[PDB]
Chain A
Amino acid sequence: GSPLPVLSWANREEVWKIMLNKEKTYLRDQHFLEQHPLLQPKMRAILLDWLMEVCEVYKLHRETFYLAQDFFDRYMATQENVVKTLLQLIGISSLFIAAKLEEIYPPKLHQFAYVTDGACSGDEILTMELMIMKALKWRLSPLTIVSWLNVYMQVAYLNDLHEVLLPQYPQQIFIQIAELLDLCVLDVDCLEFPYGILAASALYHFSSSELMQKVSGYQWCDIENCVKWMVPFAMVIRETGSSKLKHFRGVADEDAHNIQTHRDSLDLLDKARA
């Protein structure tokens, strides 16, 4: 189904079908690490968690991190046999491509080499960003996990006057659902479920199946498998509590929720495995 209201600028069904049709263009394999026998699934969590902290330091958007995550997972599905020391270069270069795509004033190249503590030079990043973009066939415009949550939050707080392009939803509850998604993305088995399913399943754990269905259009049977998989991750967030909306100097308060944050986590991803 389609949860979008009647759109004045295009057919509400057409815009939704286009967003759905491109999800079939972007493939994900939850077992792409079997192509790299030397790697373990925990290394991916350590890298993605590091990229989160890098985003918060430079106040990068959540969309920028999830672009780097998607570029990393899809580039690995095209490669074979990768060593641990090469993971940091692929990750920081995926974030370099993502920052140049999303940010208005992105950080400079040497700053991306600066956070690597010298393990990656500026020329190494430029060589890696070209190999990533060429291997991905320059398919660098995916619908991230966090982008779906932005859609679901706008539809949840749609007024009777249907205007879906101007943002209007509580920032406090948005960052709480993003916190659950930031944990689930550290586990590689999330790629089994589509990005739109993961975001709807995280929204369900903070709301209900009726609210989820009204804003995502997906039936309960579609997300039940994902919800049952997201079960351990949801409770670890509930046991520790919900996070507060931070304020970032230089960032307007109306955009404060879109800034990527970082909690220690990691240990939380291990509690979910039990």
Chain B
Amino acid sequence: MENFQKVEKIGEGTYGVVYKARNKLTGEVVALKKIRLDTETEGVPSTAIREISLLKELNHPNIVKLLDVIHTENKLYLVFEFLHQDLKKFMDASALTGIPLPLIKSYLFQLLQGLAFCHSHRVLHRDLKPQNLLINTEGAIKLADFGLARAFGVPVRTYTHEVVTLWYRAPEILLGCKYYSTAVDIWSLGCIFAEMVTRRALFPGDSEIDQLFRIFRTLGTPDEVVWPGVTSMPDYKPSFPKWARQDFSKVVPPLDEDGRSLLSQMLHYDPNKRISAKAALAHPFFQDVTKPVPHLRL
């Protein structure tokens, strides 16, 4: 840890203490996550062991790379690739002028690619929020903060309850589903998609029941037809008010009919029917950004 010189503190949160460092010989800048082991009674935190092992096998252009893990003096340094800005600060800076639609389409496309890579490797992110989406000066956006991530088995079992930040939490989590998998990340990305379009959080709830009612107020109170088994979920109440689904022309006005279709499929109540990351890449919303590969029908 000699060639690195701290430049500025990026922030301290649930992730830990992140500094912006600069290599003196090469000029490289990195993001340095500092973990004080003398403070941790249980040794290396479980979130750190998970994140390190998952990221050493998730090498993808749309995932923030883990470069090195250095254990020096009762401290654990995690060297990450550096990106200069998170998506939340970019959307706020763009709130008056609006993010250009080609850039929204490009960002969502890249996010779906990095997410499809995570899911094909059987990894749930479980904390997709604009603060965890990092962009550089070359038009790229990348998934970051895999501390809340978990690799799921085939089949899955009952995992940690009440995951994902509240505003981006899927309705099946709010209703207390036993099992969950890749659909929770697609919901979060659908919320982020609409947030880039409207420059405002789609469901800015303050409690679990208020988050659920905000979802019901926009997408309609779900029933057994649109979501088989919803009435049997532990947190479902028959006393839930009945709201009608709002026309997506009012939810996302600037979005065209291809965008509204993709957003609807990412916000489907039924997690089994909710569009997958790979299928979303094939949606006609990106037909101008990508061309399909020939499929071997064997």
Give the B-binding residues of A (Cβ under 8 A). Answer: 4, 8-11, 14-15, 18-19, 22, 25, 63, 96-97, 100-101, 104, 106, 108-109, 125-126, 129-130, 133-134, 137-141, 147, 150-151, 154, 163-168, 252, 254-255, 258
Chain B residue at minimal CB-CB distance from A25? B57
Q: Contact: B43 with A126, CB < 8 Å?
A: yes
* Interface pair A9/B56, CB less than 8 Å apart: no
A151 CB contacts on chain B under 8 angstroms: 153-155
- A-contact 0/1 string along B42-61, CB 8 Å cutoff: 11101001101110110000
B120 touches A10 (CB 8 A): yes
Interface stretch among B89-97, B193-201, B276-284? B276-284
B43 and A14 form a contact (CB under 8 A): no
Q: Which of B49, B153, B178 contacts A100 (CB 8 A)?
A: B49
Closest beta carbon of chain B to A148's beta carbon, Å: 10
CA–CA, A104 to B181, complex, Å? Answer: 16
The residues of B that contact A8 with a CB separation of less than 8 Å are 276, 279
B272 at the interface (CB under 8 A from A): yes
Interface string of B257-298 (1 = CB under 8 A from A): 000000000000000100011110000000000000000000
B contacts with A: majority SS: loop
Q: In the complex, what's the smallest C-beta–C-beta distance from B297 to chain A, in angstroms?
A: 13
Task: Give the contacts of B222-264 with A (CB-CB under 8 A).
Answer: none
Which residue from A101, A130, A255 sits with its C-beta under 8 Å from B158?
A255
Whether the pair B71, A100 counts as a contact (CB closer than 8 A) is: no
**Of B53, B152, B160, B278, which contacts A165 at CB under 8 A?**
B152
Q: Please state if B42 and A141 are interface contacts (CB–CB under 8 Å).
A: no
Task: Show 5 A/B contacts (Cβ-Cβ < 8 Å), sorted by A.
Answer: A8-B279, A15-B122, A137-B56, A141-B53, A166-B179
Extra contacts besides A11-B120, A134-B71, A167-B157 (11): CB < 8 Å: A9-B277, A100-B44, A109-B43, A130-B43, A140-B49, A141-B57, A150-B155, A151-B155, A164-B154, A165-B152, A255-B158
| A-B pairs with lowest CB-CB distance, top 5 | A167-B155, A140-B53, A10-B120, A100-B46, A126-B43
| A141 B71 Cβ-Cβ under 8 A | no
Given A15-B120, A138-B56, A141-B151, CB of A10 within 8 Å of CB of B179: no
Contacts of B179 in A (CB 8 A): 165-167
* Cβ B50 vs Cβ A164 within 8 A: no
- A18 to B156, alpha carbons, bound, how many Å? 17
Q: A141-B57, A163-B272 are in contact. Are A18 and B46 (CB under 8 A)?
A: no
Bin chain B's interface residue count: 35 or more
- Chain B residue with minimal CB distance to A169? B155
Given contacts A130-B71, A141-B151, A165-B154, contact A18 B53 (CB under 8 A): no
Check A165 against B155 for contact (C-beta < 8 Å). yes
- Which residues of B have CB within 8 Å of A14? 120
Determine the distance from Cα of A133 to Cα of B49 in the docked complex, in whole angstroms: 9
- Name the B residues within 8 Å of A96 (CB-CB): 43
B56 touches A125 (CB 8 A): no
- Find chain B residues with CB under 8 A from A18 CB: 120-122
A166/B49 contact (C-beta < 8 A), A9-B119, A14-B120 known: no
| Distance of A165 Cα from B52 Cα, bound (Å) | 25
| B137 sits at the interface (CB 8 A) | no
Is B41 part of the binding interface, using a Cβ–Cβ cutoff of 8 Å? yes
Contact (Cβ within 8 A) A165 B181: yes
Q: How far is the CA of A166 from the CA of B181 in the complex (A)?
A: 9
- A138 lies within 8 A of B120 (CB): no
When chains A and B are docked, how far (Å) is the Cα of A4 from the Cα of B158? 21
Are B157 and A258 closer than 8 Å at their CB atoms? yes
